[PDB]
C-alpha cells in the first residue's frame, strides 16, 4: 500500500490520554522555503481572488513522536508538535511542486518534511455495541479524495505544562468530530485510545493520529442518528457498517481500492493494535480462523 506508511504503532492495545506528553515548540515549525514564503502568499492571493469566502485557520504540525521502552512506567509517548495553517498547507503539501520541496528538505536539513506544513489530522475506528466499524462516503465535489470512503475525523484547530492541554484538545477533538458528523450524543462514546500515527504519501507525507472509540449504540441506532440530522447536518453523502469480523481481511476486498489513505491508516492500525490477539484463548483456531 504505497499511499500509507506507519510512523507509530502504540503498545498495550492503544494509549489513553494520561500516558501521553506533548512538547509544543517553535523548534517543531516548518522551515521557511529556500526562495522565501512569498511563494505561499502568492498561491493564497490567487485562491482568495477566485473564492473570497475562504478563511485561514491554525493547525497543529507533527514534527515527530517518540515511544518509551515497552513495559515501562510513566509517560509512554512524547509528541513533538509545532504550529502551521490551512494557508501553509495549500502552498506546500497541496502544491504541484510538493515532491521538489521534499527533495530540497532531504538535501538542506536531512528531513523530507522540513519545508512542508504537515497539518496533523485525527481519525477514529468507531465500533458499535453490535460489533461493526462505521464508514462515511465522501462527496464527489470536494477537492481531496472525492467520492472515496472515509472514517470519522478532521484537522483540529489550536485553542507538559501547556503540553497536557494540547493532548486534551487532540482527544477532545476526535469525539467532537464524531458528534458533529455522525450526530451521536457525547455520552454514548468511550474515552479514545490512540492506536498509532499514519502518513498519507499522496499528500506529501502529512500524518493523522488514529484513535479507537467504542459507542454504546447499535449500528441501527447510529444510522438513525446520522440520517435524522438531514442532508445539511453532515459533509458526507452516506454512512455504512462492516462487521469487526470482516475488517480483518478488508485489504483483500474491492472496498480497499475506494478507501482514502487516512482511513486505510485507521483500519491497518485497528487490525494490528485492537485485532491480532496475543493470548491462548483469543488465539485458538475456532476464534482466530487461519488464512
Ligand X SMILES: O=S1(=O)C[C@H](NCc2cccnc2)[C@@H](O)C1
> In this complex, which beta carbon is closest to ligand X, that of residue 137 or of residue 272?
137
The Cα-based distances of 217 to 20, 135, 271, 274 in angstroms read 28, 15, 22, 20
Residue 262 annotated in ligand binding: yes
Return the number of other C-beta atoms located less than 10 Å from residue 152's C-beta. Answer: 27
Is 212 known to sit in a ligand binding site? no
**Residue 155, marked binder:** yes
Could you please report the per-residue DSSP string of 179-194? HHHH---GGGBPPPEE
Q: Is residue 61 within the footprint of ligand X (CB under 6 A)? A: no
Select from 89, 135, 211, 226 the one that contacts ligand X (CB under 6 A): 89
Quick one: DSSP state of residue 13?
T
Q: Which position has the grid cell 494520561?
A: 18
Q: Which is nearer to ligand X, 10 or 266 (CB)?
A: 266
- Of 69-77, 86-94, 220-228, 268-276, which part binds ligand X (CB under 6 A)? 86-94
The kind and range of the H/E element at 198 are strand 193-200
- Single out the residue of 31, 80, 155, 248 in contact with ligand X (rule: CB under 6 A): 155
Figure out which of the listed residues 44, 60, 86, 211 binds ligand X, where binding follows CB under 6 A: 86
Residue 205: closest CA among 103, 86, 67: 103
Cell numbers at 262, concatenated: 487516512
Q: Provide the 8-state DSSP code for 53.
A: T
Pick the closer one to ligand X by CB: 86 or 132. Answer: 86
> Number of residues in contact with ligand X, rule: CB under 6 A?
8
258 annotated ligand-binding residue: no
> What 3-state class would DSSP assign to 30?
coil
Listing DSSP states for 244-259 in one string gives HHHHTTGGGSTTGGGB
Q: In the bound complex, what is the minimum distance in angstroms from residue 16's beta carbon to ligand X?
A: 25
Q: What is the DSSP letter of 271?
A: I
Residue from 60, 94, 135, 270 binding ligand X (CB under 6 A): 94
Is 86 annotated in a binding site? The answer is yes
**Cell numbers for 192:** 479514545
Helix 163-182 × helix 219-228 angle, to 10°: 80
Does 137 appear as a known binding residue?
no
Interaction with ligand X in 108-147: which residues (CB under 6 A)? 119, 143-144
Show the cell assigned to 154: 478532521
Q: Kindly tell me which of 155 and 272 has the beta carbon lying closer to ligand X.
A: 155
Q: In the bound complex, what is the minimum distance in angstroms from residue 7's beta carbon to ligand X?
A: 17
Binding residues for Mg(2+): 177, 181
Binding residues: 55, 86, 138, 143, 150, 155, 157, 177, 181, 262
Binding residues for substrate: 55, 86, 138, 143, 150, 155, 157, 262
Which residues of this protein are in contact with ligand X, per CB under 6 A?
Answer: 59, 86, 89, 94, 119, 143-144, 155
Amino acid at each position: 500500500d504505497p499511499e500509507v506508511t506507519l510512523l507509530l504503532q502504540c503498545p498495550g492495545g492503544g494509549l489513553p490520554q494520561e500516558q501521553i506528553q506533548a512538547e509544543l515548540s517553535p523548534a517543531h515549525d516548518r522551515r521557511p522555503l529556500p526562495g522565501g514564503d512569498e511563494a505561499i502568499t502568492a498561491i493564497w492571493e490567487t485562491r482568495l481572488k477566485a473564492q473570497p469566502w475562504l478563511f485561514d485557520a491554525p493547525k497543529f504540525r507533527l514534527h515527530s513522536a517518540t515511544l518509551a521502552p515497552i513495559g515501562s512506567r510513566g509517560p509512554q509517548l512524547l509528541l513533538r508538535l509545532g504550529l502551521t495553517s490551512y494557508r501553509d498547507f495549500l502552498g506546500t503539501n497541496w502544491s504541484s511542486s510538493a515532491a521538489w520541496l521534499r527533495q530540497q528538505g532531504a538535501t538542506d536539513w536531512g528531513d523530507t518534511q522540513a519545508y512542508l506544513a504537515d497539518p496533523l489530522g485525527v481519525g477514529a475506528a468507531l465500533a458499535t455495541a453490535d460489533d461493526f466499524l462505521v464508514f462515511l462516503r465522501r462527496s464527489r465535489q470536494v477537492a481531496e479524495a472525492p467520492g472515496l470512503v472515509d472514517v470519522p475525523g478532521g484537522h483540529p484547530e489550536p485553542q507538559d505544562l501547556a503540553g497536557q492541554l494540547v493532548v486534551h484538545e487532540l482527544f477532545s477533538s476526535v469525539l467532537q468530530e464524531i458528534c458533529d458528523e455522525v450526530n451521536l450524543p457525547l455520552l454514548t462514546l468511550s474515552q479514545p485510545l490512540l492506536l498509532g500515527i499514519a502518513r498519507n504519501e499522496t499528500s506529501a507525507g502529512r500524518a493523522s493520529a488514529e484513535f479507537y472509540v467504542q459507542c454504546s449504540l447499535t449500528s441501527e441506532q447510529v444510522r438513525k442518528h446520522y440520517l435524522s440530522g438531514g442532508p445539511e447536518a453532515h459533509e458526507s453523502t452516506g454512512i455504512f457498517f462492516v462487521e469487526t469480523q470482516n475488517v480483518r481481511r478488508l485489504p483483500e476486498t474491492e472496498m480497499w481500492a475506494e478507501l482514502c489513505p487516512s482511513a486505510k491508516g485507521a483500519i491497518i492500525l485497528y487490525n494490528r493494535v485492537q485485532g491480532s490477539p496475543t493470548g491462548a484463548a483469543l488465539g485458538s483456531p475456532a476464534l482466530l480462523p487461519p488464512l
